Design an enzyme around this catalytic site. Structure first.
Site, PDB file in Angstrom:
ATOM      1  CD  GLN D  11      -2.808   1.272   2.387  1.00  0.00           C
ATOM      2  OE1 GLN D  11      -2.725   2.062   3.341  1.00  0.00           O
ATOM      3  NE2 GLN D  11      -3.807   0.413   2.257  1.00  0.00           N
ATOM      4  CD  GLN D  15      -2.729   4.467  -0.450  1.00  0.00           C
ATOM      5  OE1 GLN D  15      -3.927   4.274  -0.680  1.00  0.00           O
ATOM      6  NE2 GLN D  15      -2.274   4.886   0.748  1.00  0.00           N
ATOM      7  CD  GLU D  71      -5.423  -4.590  -0.150  1.00  0.00           C
ATOM      8  OE1 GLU D  71      -6.378  -4.614  -0.941  1.00  0.00           O
ATOM      9  OE2 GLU D  71      -5.313  -3.736   0.766  1.00  0.00           O
ATOM     10  CD  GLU D 183       3.394  -0.641  11.224  1.00  0.00           C
ATOM     11  OE1 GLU D 183       4.275   0.070  10.694  1.00  0.00           O
ATOM     12  OE2 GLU D 183       2.174  -0.610  10.911  1.00  0.00           O
ATOM     13  CG  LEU D 252      19.948   4.598 -10.734  1.00  0.00           C
ATOM     14  CD1 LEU D 252      19.020   3.333 -10.744  1.00  0.00           C
ATOM     15  CD2 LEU D 252      19.333   5.810 -10.026  1.00  0.00           C
ATOM     16  CD  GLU D 254      27.131  11.522 -10.609  1.00  0.00           C
ATOM     17  OE1 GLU D 254      26.760  11.234 -11.777  1.00  0.00           O
ATOM     18  OE2 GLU D 254      27.220  12.696 -10.158  1.00  0.00           O
TER      19      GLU D 254
HETATM   20  N1  LIG Z   1       3.647   7.981   4.203  1.00  0.00           N
HETATM   21  C1  LIG Z   1       2.831   6.959   3.960  1.00  0.00           C
HETATM   22  N2  LIG Z   1       2.956   5.789   4.682  1.00  0.00           N
HETATM   23  C2  LIG Z   1       2.128   4.744   4.441  1.00  0.00           C
HETATM   24  C3  LIG Z   1       1.146   4.840   3.464  1.00  0.00           C
HETATM   25  N3  LIG Z   1       0.472   3.670   3.433  1.00  0.00           N
HETATM   26  C4  LIG Z   1       1.002   2.840   4.360  1.00  0.00           C
HETATM   27  N4  LIG Z   1       2.025   3.493   4.997  1.00  0.00           N
HETATM   28  C5  LIG Z   1       2.870   2.938   6.068  1.00  0.00           C
HETATM   29  O1  LIG Z   1       2.817   1.525   6.008  1.00  0.00           O
HETATM   30  C6  LIG Z   1       2.538   0.966   7.275  1.00  0.00           C
HETATM   31  C7  LIG Z   1       1.636  -0.250   7.109  1.00  0.00           C
HETATM   32  O2  LIG Z   1       2.249  -1.185   6.248  1.00  0.00           O
HETATM   33  P1  LIG Z   1       1.960  -1.189   4.663  1.00  0.00           P
HETATM   34  O3  LIG Z   1       3.216  -0.964   3.859  1.00  0.00           O
HETATM   35  O4  LIG Z   1       0.921  -0.143   4.341  1.00  0.00           O
HETATM   36  O5  LIG Z   1       1.352  -2.649   4.362  1.00  0.00           O
HETATM   37  P2  LIG Z   1       0.704  -2.946   2.918  1.00  0.00           P
HETATM   38  O6  LIG Z   1       1.476  -2.224   1.841  1.00  0.00           O
HETATM   39  O7  LIG Z   1      -0.749  -2.539   2.909  1.00  0.00           O
HETATM   40  O8  LIG Z   1       0.824  -4.539   2.721  1.00  0.00           O
HETATM   41  P3  LIG Z   1       0.278  -5.541   3.858  1.00  0.00           P
HETATM   42  O9  LIG Z   1      -0.183  -4.754   5.061  1.00  0.00           O
HETATM   43  O10 LIG Z   1       1.404  -6.464   4.253  1.00  0.00           O
HETATM   44  O11 LIG Z   1      -0.858  -6.365   3.302  1.00  0.00           O
HETATM   45  C8  LIG Z   1       1.883   2.064   8.095  1.00  0.00           C
HETATM   46  O12 LIG Z   1       2.342   2.032   9.426  1.00  0.00           O
HETATM   47  C9  LIG Z   1       2.309   3.351   7.421  1.00  0.00           C
HETATM   48  O13 LIG Z   1       3.302   3.994   8.184  1.00  0.00           O
HETATM   49  C10 LIG Z   1       1.012   6.013   2.733  1.00  0.00           C
HETATM   50  O14 LIG Z   1       0.145   6.106   1.867  1.00  0.00           O
HETATM   51  N5  LIG Z   1       1.859   7.073   2.985  1.00  0.00           N
HETATM   52 MG   LIG Z   2      -1.943  -3.836   2.059  1.00  0.00          MG
END
Ligand SMILES: Nc1nc2c(ncn2[C@@H]2O[C@H](COP(=O)(O)OP(=O)(O)OP(=O)(O)O)[C@@H](O)[C@H]2O)c(=O)[nH]1
Ligand SMILES: [Mg+2]
Ligand SMILES: CC[C@]1(O)C[C@@H]2CN(CCc3c([nH]c4cc(OC)ccc34)[C@@](C(=O)OC)(c3cc4c(cc3OC)N(C)[C@H]3[C@@](O)(C(=O)OC)[C@H](OC(C)=O)[C@]5(CC)C=CCN6CC[C@]43[C@@H]65)C2)C1
Ligand SMILES: Nc1nc2c(ncn2[C@@H]2O[C@H](COP(=O)(O)OP(=O)(O)O)[C@@H](O)[C@H]2O)c(=O)[nH]1
Ligand SMILES: [Ca+2]
EC number: 3.6.5.-
Lengths: 331, 54, 428, 439
Positions: D11, D15, D71, D183, D252, D254
């Site tokens: 995610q 994003q 997902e 985390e 890269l 560099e």
């Molecule tokens: N800055 C920022 N951090 C994000 C964002 N989305 C998720 N995070 C970070 O990601 C953490 C959660 O893990 P994710 O990388 O989102 O997990 P995921 O990509 O959804 O994949 P799974 O959870 O393993 O299914 C959170 O504590 C956030 O700090 C975002 O859109 N911007």
């Molecule tokens: Mg996810």
């Protein structure tokens, strides 16, 4: 209602600070590893400075200035004073000092200045012939420092006895520099001895290595009322004019010099620290800086007042509850 | 003190300024390690199913 | 599609399950016939977690209804949303279990369970991405208790990789006068401690004390109790039913709530506490929600939180409100009572906020706590249990279905185990 | 000209990638359908932006990007969003069931089932490349995918492409936005397993971004789009040298030589100034001096920490807007007397400087005011290890009671992989302290 943790259990001064805080009915104390604290009275070593300031919902304050050791370790100080143009060689209140390594070092530079009356110092050891002293630092393995031993110490009468001065200085988070109005004179119990610096106790005026070889003043602790009164009567001056003015200029200069390196003005946690400054007064009523201690204890009489001044100036400013014993050194 | 390697474009420029001078595993080992735990896990499961069979 | 299969079993299980489908159906804009009426689209974004769709955009609860006797099912069929459950999903017997765990687990229930699994299978057949199962049932009777846990054991053997979740109504002398309930509950807890991922401890002692002391209900009916139960079930399912970031499916919730596999029993809380009908006039401030959310007078398990330590905590806020204020009030809860959250699990409180509020409230909060203070609930049942067991009293009702005292001694030992394991981590 | 492939995992990586590619399109004038009116290289060209976009015979400029989430919820938004025609279906890869914030479930369990498909879709791009130089990889530390799949990809990348560079943009976990208690466990694991496979990693602490958004954008409760529009500025700043004519950081390799004399210590600290609320009723514009100085304030870094206590190894200044060198060296000349900027004995106290005259591009309706000059500093300071000591502490408190460990073991992973990862991190904190040892 605030919270704090005690992580240095052998601190007389912060024992009384915690005691004082609990007794306010507005300061919970938590288990030393609970993160959710406001105040940390920290260990004297390896304090986790990088762990402060990341508790959302919590303003955190710690009782040490990260980096302040540069002022509070014998050989660091020597380096700090030489290399800081703020202080430097236009500096006249520090004895000539040289860091020396028991075999980026200045043991080379030391011998040339020795060439001229000459006396110097390191349980350490004071002497006058070079060839032997260096052999001592080579005994133990840690880099210590050798400075001019003041051959003309001002001497209290009656007793003809050497002393040093200790001022307690409190730096708050905004970097206000506070000097406690009450200082103390650590007074050698037996008389100073000219030629022959080989007996200690009367040369080294440290409390410990003295409360073990003693009359004149209770605990070998002379306070300012008496020392100022002695100054009026024997020498015809006052404490403020003859000694204090020099001291305050030396405190202000030292702490201003390192300020950019340790200030917490814009930092995610805040700091205050209590320092003990040790000065010697010499024959011509000139003041010299000996060491700065970052973890000072207080004089028994003056604990209640200083340890409550810390609470009021350093802690209750940042965490307010529901005449001043310090002098603000202005800069 | 000393600007160096200046380069200029229509878009911008770039340089260097010195104030003072100085003084791996293989696709197989991966598949081995991946399948080492696809097993440790398939066993933890069959052990569950066995306990359920009792 | 991350589907959930809901099962309700026995009288209690079916009553509180009927009420849950009532509530979440209203919340999602579905009517006593299965057709959507949303002044919003947040409603339908995750509707398929608890519903399948038909032609005519008809939604049907992915619910299975199970009992050894045909009542309740009839009152559920002749009830509010009766006509909206799929008919071939009422799965029932005739003899009943007569508040006897062995009857439900070993004799009467055996006869009926295979046919329950067939309906499960058919529902499991047709999920893109099955999350797992949620079961409603009481632990003091025979069907929900004995046959509910048999079911759980058979489902886990077919679907060992799905999440097992229950809402388990605990028995209390204040509410029920059947004398073998400590037996049926210690036998079920034994099962639940081994075969589920999350269990909400809905304690009838709490429900009773809340209705009597706090809501000033002098003659509490199971409707009064179940009013508290659906509110809480509505609350604790919020993050599965609308879009969101935290605890948004069962496994993520379990990874957040369960640090040790056996310690997966949760204390729900709810705020404001309401009586049915009793209309609301001034919404709570955000700081109000918070203090009540953690107030022991709001817990649905009769346990004293200040007698334990929170291992983990999920908090769910509903209704239009400021996340900043919510953020501040939750940090202040933790920093003013930090002693009560284990220091060795950093940042163990997670907070979600959903904009849709629960019917007839503008502001609500649901608490889900994994507190070592739950050992109190298991101690209470364990004491009632020993007082009969050391004289082997009423035991003939179970030995006559095939059970050995030994099974009883095991269940007792496992639950005492559970209690001491809760004490280990409270003194850590 | 040499191509760079962007890989966005989980995610947070997906994003964040979207925020970057949005910005990249505004900055290179590329519409939401891939048409670049000012390219005359129709159907090709070896321009500086061609490192990040390839071109269609029909005139469409298409990111050299691969997004991948276990997902579909997020990446589905990408396949239906304002930039759908941009990417082509084969580069948006989703599974069906995610890692449940579980490093093991993303590395060992659900990883195995998809690593191949993705390495396929990645080599599919490597083959529209004339001289591909390596990979930029966007992922969180804390999710199960971002930590566990990402570390799996990295190892296979250092097998199918042994001679290519790999950079990371890594989101470091912060409780104010985190969604998992574990985390810290995932952060350590994926670092240990990714360390020997990453050439240079840019760590952004969600804590730091979140406070710049409250303090300097006066946003009560920063959301992910707030965080991500700011992260995209800083990422764009760091990558502008790969996409534009210039002579600093032109490939890269560099970044390695400029920022990383010590390979394990490949975590350079980013600092960005100025961040100005586009709501502010006019801002008195800031000088080359002021913004350059603002680079030495912790409150502007992507990781809170105190570079006064720590030594430097490399420092890069990356300017956008009205800047000429004379201003830069005057500014540097000044701060050097006012500030604690100590390098290591074996490195020259100096700054590599990059100026692009185009001021920073703002997203219409974002929170950032347009400004005439802006700067991103890239400094390899040991002070960044404060963030390693924080994360390692949290890991020590939980692991000493095995809390939640059963979730990882449950997925095939051996309890001992925990302790191995933590010892590697304990070595890292040791390396860092060696280098900052004086005082
Ligand atoms: N800055 C920022 N951090 C994000 C964002 N989305 C998720 N995070 C970070 O990601 C953490 C959660 O893990 P994710 O990388 O989102 O997990 P995921 O990509 O959804 O994949 P799974 O959870 O393993 O299914 C959170 O504590 C956030 O700090 C975002 O859109 N911007
Ligand atoms: Mg996810
Ligand atoms: C939510 C579901 C329920 O509706 C909850 C309950 C019980 N139930 C049936 C309804 C009912 C009640 N009372 C009745 C008397 C009666 O006549 C033939 C016929 C029916 C009822 C209860 C009520 O509404 O009472 C005003 C009701 C019932 C009981 C109660 C309080 C209570 O109040 C709210 N105690 C906590 C216990 C009791 O042991 C005790 O500890 O006292 C403090 C109690 O002994 C004394 C001294 O009272 C008593 C009274 C009959 C005696 C025998 C054992 N059992 C078991 C329940 C209990 C009861 C409502 C299900
Ligand atoms: N909260 C609540 N508890 C109930 C309800 N119905 C029964 N119970 C509890 O369940 C216990 C009896 O279980 P029972 O219904 O006989 O189990 P079954 O035979 O398997 O259906 C009693 O002690 C009640 O406290 C209900 O509608 N709401
Ligand atoms: Ca081109």
């Amino acid at each position: 209602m605030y919270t704090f943790v005690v992580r240095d259990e052998n601190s007389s001064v912060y024992a009384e600070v915690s005691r004082l805080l609990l007794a306010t009915g507005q300061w919970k104390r938590l288990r030393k590893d609970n993160p959710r604290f406001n105040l940390m009275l920290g260990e004297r070593n390896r304090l986790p400075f990088g762990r402060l300031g990341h508790e959302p919902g919590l303003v955190q304050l710690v009782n040490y200035y990260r980096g302040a050791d540069k002022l509070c370790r014998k050989a660091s100080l020597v380096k700090l004073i030489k290399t800081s143009p703020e202080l430097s060689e236009s500096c006249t209140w520090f004895p000539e000092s040289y860091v020396i390594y028991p075999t980026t070092d200045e043991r080379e530079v030391f011998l040339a200045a020795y060439n001229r009356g000459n006396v110097w110092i390191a349980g350490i050891l004071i002497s006058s012939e070079a060839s032997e002293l260096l052999d001592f630092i080579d005994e133990q393995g840690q880099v210590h420092v050798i400075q001019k031993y003041l051959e003309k110490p001002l001497l209290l009468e009656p007793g003809h006895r050497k002393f040093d001065i200790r001022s307690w200085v409190l730096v708050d988070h905004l970097y206000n520099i506070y000097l406690y109005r009450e200082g103390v004179l650590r007074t050698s119990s037996e008389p100073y001895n000219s030629a022959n610096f080989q007996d200690k106790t009367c040369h080294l005026t440290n409390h410990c290595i003295q409360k073990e070889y003693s009359r004149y003043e209770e605990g070998n602790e002379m306070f300012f009322e008496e020392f100022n009164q002695y100054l009026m009567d024997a020498l015809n001056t006052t404490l403020e004019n003859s000694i204090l003015l020099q001291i305050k200029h030396i405190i202000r200069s030292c702490l201003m010099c390192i300020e950019p390196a340790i200030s917490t003005k814009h930092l995610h946690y805040q700091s205050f620290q209590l320092f003990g400054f040790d000065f010697m007064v010499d024959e011509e009523l000139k003041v010299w800086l000996i060491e700065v201690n970052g973890a000072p204890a207080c004089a028994q009489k003056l604990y209640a007042e200083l340890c409550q001044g810390i609470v009021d100036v350093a802690i209750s400013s940042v965490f307010p509850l529901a005449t001043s014993i310090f002098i603000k050194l202005h800069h | 003190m000393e600007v160096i390697e200046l380069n200029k474009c229509t878009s911008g420029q770039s340089f260097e300024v010195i104030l003072k001078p100085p003084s791996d595993p293989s696709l197989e080992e991966i598949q081995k390690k991946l399948e080492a735990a696809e097993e440790r896990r398939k066993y933890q499961e069959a052990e569950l199913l066995k306990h359920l069979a009792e | 599609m991350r589907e959930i299969v809901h099962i309700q079993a026995g009288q209690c299980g079916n009553q509180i399950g009927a009420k849950f489908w009532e509530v979440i159906s209203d919340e999602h804009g579905i009517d006593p016939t299965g057709s959507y009426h949303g002044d919003s689209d947040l409603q339908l974004e995750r509707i398929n977690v608890y519903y399948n769709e038909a032609t005519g955009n008809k939604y049907v609860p992915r619910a299975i209804l199970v009992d050894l006797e045909p009542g309740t099912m009839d009152s559920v069929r002749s009830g509010p949303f009766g006509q909206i459950f799929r008919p071939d999903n009422f799965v029932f017997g005739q003899s009943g279990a007569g508040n006897n765990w062995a009857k439900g687990h070993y004799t009467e229930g055996a006869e009926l369970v295979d046919s329950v699994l067939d309906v499960v299978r058919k529902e499991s057949e047709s999920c893109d991405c099955l999350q797992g199962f949620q079961l409603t049932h009481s632990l003091g009777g025979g069907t929900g208790s004995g046959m509910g846990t048999l079911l759980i054991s058979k489902i886990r053997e077919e679907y060992p990789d799905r999440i097992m979740n229950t809402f388990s109504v605990m028995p209390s002398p204040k509410v029920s006068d059947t004398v073998v309930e400590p037996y049926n509950a210690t036998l079920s807890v034994h099962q639940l401690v081994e075969n589920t991922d999350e269990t909400y401890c809905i304690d009838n002692e709490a429900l009773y004390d809340i209705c009597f002391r706090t809501l000033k209900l002098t003659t509490p009916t199971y409707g009064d109790l179940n009013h508290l139960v659906s509110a809480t079930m509505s609350g604790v399912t919020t993050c599965l039913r609308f879009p969101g970031q935290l605890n948004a499916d069962l496994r993520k919730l379990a990874v957040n709530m369960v640090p040790f596999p056996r310690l997966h029993f949760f204390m729900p809380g709810f705020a404001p506490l309401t009586s049915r009908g009793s209309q609301q006039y001034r919404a709570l401030t955000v700081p109000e929600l918070t203090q009540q959310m953690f107030d022991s007078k709001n817990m649905m398990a009769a346990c004293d939180p200040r007698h334990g330590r929170y291992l983990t905590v999920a908090a769910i806020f509903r209704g239009r409100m400021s996340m900043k204020e919510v953020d501040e009030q939750m940090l202040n809860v933790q920093n003013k009572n930090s002693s009560y959250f284990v220091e060795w699990i950093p940042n163990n409180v997670k907070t979600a906020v959903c904009d849709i509020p629960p019917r007839g409230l503008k502001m609500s909060a649901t608490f889900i706590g994994n507190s070592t203070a739950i050992q109190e609930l298991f101690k209470r049942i364990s004491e009632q249990f020993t007082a009969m067991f050391r004289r082997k009293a009423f035991l003939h009702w179970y030995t006559g279905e095939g059970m050995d005292e030994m099974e009883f001694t095991e269940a007792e030992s496992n639950m005492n185990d559970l209690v001491s394991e809760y004490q280990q981590y409270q003194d850590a | 000209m040499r191509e760079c492939i962007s890989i966005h995992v989980g995610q947070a990586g997906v994003q964040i990638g979207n925020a970057c590619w949005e910005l990249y399109c505004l900055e290179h004038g590329i519409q939401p359908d891939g048409q670049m009116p000012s390219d005359k290289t129709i159907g090709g060209g070896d321009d500086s932006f061609n490192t990040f976009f390839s071109e269609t015979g029909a005139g469409k400029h298409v990111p050299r990007a691969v997004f991948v989430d276990l997902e579909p919820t997020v990446i589905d938004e990408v396949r239906t969003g304002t930039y759908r025609q941009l990417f082509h279906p084969e580069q948006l890869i989703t599974g069906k069931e995610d890692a449940a914030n579980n490093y093991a479930r993303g590395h060992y369990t659900i990883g195995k089932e998809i690593i191949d498909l993705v390495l396929d879709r990645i080599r599919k791009l490597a083959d529209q490349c004339t001289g591909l130089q390596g990979f930029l990889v966007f992922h969180s530390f804390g999710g199960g995918t971002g930590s566990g799949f990402t570390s799996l990809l990295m190892e296979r990348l250092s097998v199918d492409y042994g001679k290519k560079s790999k950079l990371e943009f890594s989101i470091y976990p912060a409780p104010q936005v985190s969604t998992a208690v574990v985390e810290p466990y995932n952060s350590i694991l994926t670092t240990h397993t990714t360390l020997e496979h990453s050439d240079c990693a840019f760590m952004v602490d969600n804590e730091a971004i979140y406070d710049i958004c409250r303090r300097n954008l006066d946003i009560e409760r920063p959301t992910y789009t707030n965080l991500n529009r700011l992260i995209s500025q800083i990422v764009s700043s760091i990558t502008a040298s790969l996409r534009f004519d210039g002579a600093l950081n032109v490939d890269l390799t560099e970044f390695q030589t400029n920022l990383v004399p010590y390979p394990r210590i490949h975590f350079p600290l980013a600092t960005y100034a100025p961040v100005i609320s586009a709501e502010k009723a006019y801002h008195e514009q800031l000088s080359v001096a002021e913004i350059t100085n603002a680079c030495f304030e912790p409150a502007n870094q992507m990781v809170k920490c105190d570079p006064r206590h720590g030594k430097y190894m490399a420092c890069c200044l990356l300017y956008r807007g009205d800047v000429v060198p004379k201003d830069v060296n005057a500014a540097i000349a000044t701060i050097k007397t006012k500030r604690s900027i100590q390098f290591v004995d074996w490195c020259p106290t100096g700054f590599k400087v990059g100026i692009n005259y185009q001021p920073p591009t703002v997203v219409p309706g974002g929170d950032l005011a347009k400004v005439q000059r802006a700067v991103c500093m890239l400094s390899n300071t040991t002070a960044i290890a404060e963030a390693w000591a924080r994360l390692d502490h949290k890991f020590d408190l939980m692991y000493a009671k095995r809390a939640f460990v059963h979730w990882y073991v449950g997925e095939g992973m051996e309890e001992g992989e925990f302790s191995e990862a933590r010892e590697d991190m304990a070595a890292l904190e040791k390396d860092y302290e060696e280098v900052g040892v004086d005082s």
